[PDB]
Amino acid sequence: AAAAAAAAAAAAAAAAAAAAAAAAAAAAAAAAAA
Amino acid sequence: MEIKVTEIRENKLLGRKEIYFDVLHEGEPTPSREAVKGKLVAMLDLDPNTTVIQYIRSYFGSNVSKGYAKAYETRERMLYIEPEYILVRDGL
Amino acid sequence: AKLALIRLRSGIRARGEVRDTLAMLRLHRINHLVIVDDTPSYRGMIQKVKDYITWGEIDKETLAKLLRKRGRLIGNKPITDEYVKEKLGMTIEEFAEKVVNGEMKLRDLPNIKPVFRLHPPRGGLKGSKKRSFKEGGALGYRGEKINELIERML
Amino acid sequence: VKRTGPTDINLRRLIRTLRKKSNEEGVKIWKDIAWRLERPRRQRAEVNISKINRYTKEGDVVIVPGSVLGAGRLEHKVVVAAWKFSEAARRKIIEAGGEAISIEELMERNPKGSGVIIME
Amino acid sequence: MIRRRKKVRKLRGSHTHGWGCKKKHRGGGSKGGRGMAGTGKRKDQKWTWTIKYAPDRLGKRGFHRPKAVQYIPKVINLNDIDENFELFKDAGIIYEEDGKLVFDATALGVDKILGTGKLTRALVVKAYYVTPKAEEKIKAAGGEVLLA
Amino acid sequence: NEKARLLRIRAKLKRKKPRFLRQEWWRYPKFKNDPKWRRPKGIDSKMRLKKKGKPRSPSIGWSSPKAVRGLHPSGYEEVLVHNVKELEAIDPTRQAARIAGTVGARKREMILARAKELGVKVLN
Amino acid sequence: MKVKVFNLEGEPVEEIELPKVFSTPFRPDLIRRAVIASWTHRIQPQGRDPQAGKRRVTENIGKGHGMARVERIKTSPRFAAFVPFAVGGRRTHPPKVEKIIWEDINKKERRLAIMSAIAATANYDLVRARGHVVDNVVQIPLVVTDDLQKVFKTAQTREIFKKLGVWDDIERAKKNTKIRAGKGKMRGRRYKKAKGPLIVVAKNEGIVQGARNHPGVDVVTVDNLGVEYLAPGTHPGRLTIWTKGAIERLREIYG
RNA sequence: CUUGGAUCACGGGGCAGGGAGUUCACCCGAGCGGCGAGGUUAAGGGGGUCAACCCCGAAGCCGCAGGGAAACCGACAGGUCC
RNA sequence: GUGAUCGGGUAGGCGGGCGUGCCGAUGGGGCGGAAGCCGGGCCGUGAGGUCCGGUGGACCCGUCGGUAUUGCGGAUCCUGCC
């Protein structure tokens, strides 16, 4: 069980293209830190 | 620097004697913890490797202070409950 | 030569120059005595406060009596031959002889307070505070006659 | 305005312990750090990782009387003692193979406080 | 935390509450006018405070453009890229091509790359405009700038 | 003995001490029936100027020695008692008990019995 | 810290390790802040009628009547009116409903305070000092099986509490309940009631009904914990009965 | 009040009860506390033992880059000394 | 421990205490007589507190933490009484 931080990328990504980057970041973090 | 024991309690679920005492110190400052341990051990026949003192407290306009001590039966039982800053404050 | 200065008058109704000079000479209160050296920088200040003090040349016997009776250490403790023989290889009489003939300073005795606090003169001042000693009063320069007054005030 | 102290009883206890330790061991650094901790909250020290990395060496020991914050890199390993760490600062100090500890544990490991660098 | 008491509680019994003579705390004359009255321009009872502390308050200077036409271009620094590298990698912004790491800033939504701070890694920066200092720092770190 | 000496000091001091009362307590029944101290605050008050022939004002110099401040003239210090548990927890060497005025007879019988069998001085 | 798990008969069966929230340092200042904010969040606004005292019509006489310059009624009695030193007039500075009573506090400080209060409930000296009777309690901290979440009879709860050793604190709560002093008795609010134990549960299946009517006893779930359950009056160290499921949910949420 | 009050300067027959720096909005500071290159939710939504409690909600605001009327341009995370 | 080199004070600034009504907690008292009122004793620099006796006949207090229409000799002050 983990608590990934994604608002850090939400506030950075250009709007209308945030959920895709969020999914990719979810997968990346799950891979690396787990 | 004299001491009068006001209360003794026993605790089996924790395994410790709880001692409440009063320190008469007139024309003198608040006594030190080493001195209080020395006198309580000289009086009540306790093992200095146990016997942590929790607090000595003075009060406004008064030459009597109050003190609380715990005498444990075993190192196991004392370390199981007492924390590190209390264990370091003493000579342990 | 060592000069003795005694304060006689109050600083109310006096100039700040005089008040500050007296503070620098450590003469804060009335019937208080100080011993200094006869240097020009001190003589100028004495001339500035000439109208509020008496001063004159002091003798060794008088200084010995003064040390034995009104001398104090930090803590307002009396001076004793025990202390003097311990800290120095002398008695009070020899210390005073030296002090007034050079070779030694009062502050060489450790923890010596530099101000002597006297009671008022026995029989009273025999001259007005508003005039000078020369014209029959009390203020200003005496000579060896400051010792008579120190004796009366001891 | 009456300047109180901290309301954290643990800070108060640490300050008293530091002064007692100074008097016991015969040193000045503990008393110094005590008066620095009794400093008004609006003037409490704050240091970033960048400053430590800038003014430290490899194998140095450092004590900060306030908070350590995460901004910059750490290129070598050092031991840092402070009252409060940030998550990022702790993580970045662990990375690079350093250790982040408390002032009490520093007093244990080193009673005389020899070789320790004060930063504030 | 600290809950002090109000000083009216202390001044209860003081007869003037710290205002001075019993003539001193009255209406607008006791201030010199209401609001910014007397700050110049017709009266000068506060012209001294005006010239000591609030110059450039009376008078106009310049013009403003319409917000219909204003555009605020977004910018980013090399320190930011290097200090947020791993998140830009986790999420798209940095990706992979043949033997190269590439930084697509248009994705981020930025128009300018400014040149504050060192650059450590080598990269290919893909963006409209880049400042000469940033160009030099990038080409020293061993990378390229390919302008779109 | 020093405690007795300080007791004599306090007794003499508080015999000499006046009862501090406001400017003109003798003149208006609104002050005769509520006697108290109020500091004189007027611009032309002689009690404020501390003139001769006028009543005096309180100051920190009238205080009693710390050692004997607050003790019963007997020499003990007082402890209010409402129950027998409070009666206990008294040092019968330096403290005495004063029974609260709201306690009933049924209960103060018990308090007096326990004080008797404990050796505690009761001022009532 | 390892602890035993007790059954409804008062016997230890299992052994479990406490989570780290029970090792949180002690912060009575934050506990107090949070309790005071919670106090503020349930009080009603109060004000007077804004037109009260301002119903009379007046006329002042002015200079030259051997009288003061006060506004007075203009019929038979001619009593003064409308001024704040007149009898029946307006009040100078009355209470107002515009006034702000709400106090805000941040989530993270609130949660730190809750954690500290939990750690305090897991300490013996604080529980005793607060005023609770713990002469015959089993563990401090007391952890009991999940079978207690299903008891819906007050008499069965009575028996279980007798076997665990908190019936004496319940009796203290009953005994130390009094009729107030003052005017709160007119406004309801009589019978100032003392506090007893607090049962923290994972899920309610009848224990709420079963234990409700014992004086001083509170029942709460973990997801709905606050600092007023754990530190009534700003004083921490309340006698608390935990459950295994509640402690696991603590291991998960940590706050 | 006044430079100046025992005043031939003003207020003062007695007693009891009432009677005067309050609230909001913005701004400048401080004594504490939390998080910290980030901080913080508002309106509102869900649950509950239902005005207390718990969980969501970062829209927006301040800060991380300034200079310039504007178009525009766009910086030391450490070189030396006391 | 030091203070010959601290001890007057208006406007004004700062620190600590006494007292009054309500709330959350804790410890208590009361028809074997609470609150209030009258006269007295003791402690306290003091703001005040507590005890004794009498009257009275149903509620009251201490400690911690919060709140406030929170302290009168004056306003040719307001109401009532003399």
Give the span between the Cα atoms of A29 and A27, in whole angstroms. Answer: 6
Contact B88 D104 (CB under 8 A): yes
Q: Is D117 helix (H, G, I), strand (E, B) or coil?
A: strand
User: Using CA atoms, how far apart are residues D84 and C136, in angstroms rounded to an integer?
Assistant: 81
Q: Is B4 on the interface with F (CB under 8 A)?
A: yes
Task: Look at the block and give the residue holding tokens 């606004």.
Answer: G45
Phi, psi angles (nearest 5°) of residue A18: -105, -40
- Given an 8 Å threshold on Cβ–Cβ distance, is A32 in contact with E90? yes
- Quote the CA–CA distance of C48 and C18 in Å, as a whole number: 7
- Answer whether D83's CB lies under 8 Å from D67's CB: yes
Count CB atoms within 10 A of the CB of residue D7. Answer: 16
Q: Tell me which residue has tokens 């040193």.
A: D27
Write the DSSP string, E18-71. TS-STTSS-SGGGTTSSTTTTSBBTB-SSHHHHHHH-TTSSS-------TTT--
Indicate the burial class of E138 (C-beta count within 10 angstroms; 0-12, 13-18, 19 or more): buried
How far apart CA D77 and CA F44 sit, in angstroms, is: 77
Q: Residue G163 class from Cβ within 10 Å (0-12 exposed, 13-18 middle, 19+ buried)?
A: middle
Which nucleotides of chain H are near protein (any atom < 7 Å from a CB)? 1-2, 5-6, 14-25, 30-38, 40-42, 47-49, 51-55, 58-59, 65, 69-71, 73-78
Rounded Cα distance between C14 and C52, Å, is 10
Nearest CA-CA partner of G6 in G145, G136, G121, G140: G145
* Pair G22, G1: CB distance under 8 Å: yes
Strand partners, G192: G178
E17: left (phi over 0), alpha (psi -120 to 50) or beta: left
Nearest partner of C65 among C102, C36, C30, C100, judged by Cα:
C100
Residue F2 contacts strand H, CB under 7 A = no
- The DSSP output letter for G80 is B
- The torsion angle over the Cα atoms of residues C85, C89, C91 and C92, rounded to 10 degrees, is -90
Cα C86 from Cα G17, distance rounded (Å): 73
Cβ within 8 Å, pair D13-B88 = no
Sort residue C64 into left (φ over 0), alpha (ψ -120 to 50) or beta.
alpha
CA gap C100, C93 in Å, rounded:
11
Method: cryo-EM
Q: Which two structure tokens, joined as six digits, stand for G94?
A: 């009355």
CB D120 within 8 A of CB D45: yes
Type of residue found at D50: S
Q: How far is B11 from chain D (nearest CA, A)?
A: 28
The 8-class DSSP code of residue F60 comes to: G
- What's CA C106's distance to the chain center, in Å? 12
Residue C5 in contact with residue C36, Cβ under 8 Å? Answer: yes
CB atoms under 10 Å from CB of E49, counted, come to: 13
E133 touches strand H (CB under 7 A): yes
How many other CB atoms are there within 10 angstroms of residue E60's CB atom? 5
Residue whose structure tokens are 């963006």? E127
Strand, coil or helix: what is G32? helix
| CA–CA distances in Å: residue G249 to residues G18, G31, G204 | 12, 22, 14
Contacts of C42 (CB under 8 A, 6+ apart): C3, C36
Query: How many helices (H) and strands (E) in chain E?
Result: 6, 7
Both tokens assigned to F98: 């004063």
Residue A13: list chain E partners with CB under 8 A: 91, 107-109
Which 27-56 positions of E have CB less than 7 A from strand H? none
For residue G66, which nucleotide's C1' is closest to its Cα? Answer: I76
Distance F124 CA to I47 C1' (A): 28
On whether the CB atoms of residues C57 and C50 are closer than 8 A, the answer is: no
Kindly determine whether residue B6 and residue F89, on different chains, have CB atoms separated by under 8 Å: yes
- Can you spell out the DSSP letters for B1-43? -EEEEEEEEEETTTTEEEEEEEEE-SSS-PPPHHHHHHHHHHH
Strands (E), chain D: 46-48, 61-69, 79-85, 99-101, 116-118
Chain B residues closer than 8 Å to D104 by CB: 85, 88
The C-alpha atoms of residue F83 and residue F116 are separated, in whole angstroms, by 15
Measured between beta carbons, which residues in chain G are less than 8 angstroms from residue B80? Answer: 1
- Kindly calculate the radius of gyration of chain B based on its CA atoms and give it in whole angstroms: 13
Identify the residue whose tokens are 């602890």.
Answer: G3
Which nucleotide is nearest, taking the CA of residue D40 and each C1'?
H31
Contact G157, G255 (CB under 8 A): no
**Measured in angstroms, what separates residue A20's CA from nucleotide H75's C1'?**
35
Q: Cβ(F74)–Cβ(F98) under 8 Å?
A: no
**E6 Cβ within 7 A of any nucleic strand H atom:** yes
Distance CA D72, CA D63 (A): 18
Distance CA D73, CA E85 (A): 13
Distance, CA of D78 to CA of D97 (rounded, Å):
8
User: What are D72-76's contacts with CB under 8 Å, separation 24+?
Assistant: D72/D48, D73/D49, D74/D49, D74/D98
CA dihedral G49, G50, G52, G56 (to 10 degrees): -150
Q: How far apart are CA E135 and CA F115, in angstroms?
A: 95
Strand H proximal to E128 Cβ, under 7 A: no
**Residue E61 to residue E56: CA distance in whole angstroms:** 9
For chain E, the first-to-last Cα distance in angstroms comes to 57
Q: DSSP letter at E145?
A: E
| DSSP string covering C95-145 | HHHHHHTSS--GGGSTTB-S-EEPPPPTT--SS-TTSBTTTTSSBEE-STT
Chains C and F touch (3+ CB pairs under 8 A): no
State whether D7 and G29 contact (CB < 8 Å): yes
Using a 10 angstrom Cβ sphere, with 0-12 exposed, 13-18 middle and 19 or more buried, the burial of residue F2 is exposed
**Nucleic acid strand H within 7 Å of G92 CB:** yes
With beta carbons under 8 A apart, name residues in chain A contacting E107: 13-14, 17
**Cα G176 versus chain centre, distance:** 17
Cα–Cα distance for residue pair E120/G68, rounded to 1 Å: 88
Residue E135, SS3 per DSSP: helix
Q: How far is CA E64 from CA D4, E58, E61, E68, E73, in A?
A: 50, 18, 10, 12, 18
Q: How far is F79 from chain B (nearest CA, A)?
A: 14
Nearest-neighbour CA in chain B from D98: distance (Å)? 24
Q: Do A20 and E92 touch (CB under 8 A)?
A: yes
Secondary structure element (H or E) that encloses residue C36, with its range: strand C32-37
Task: Name the nt closest to A11 by C-alpha to C1'.
Answer: H58
Rounded CA gap, G56 and G71, in Å?
10
Whether the CB-CB separation of D94 and D70 falls below 8 Å is answered with no
Residues closing a segment before a gap in chain G (C–N exceeding 2.5 Å): none
Contact A8 E87 (CB under 8 A): yes
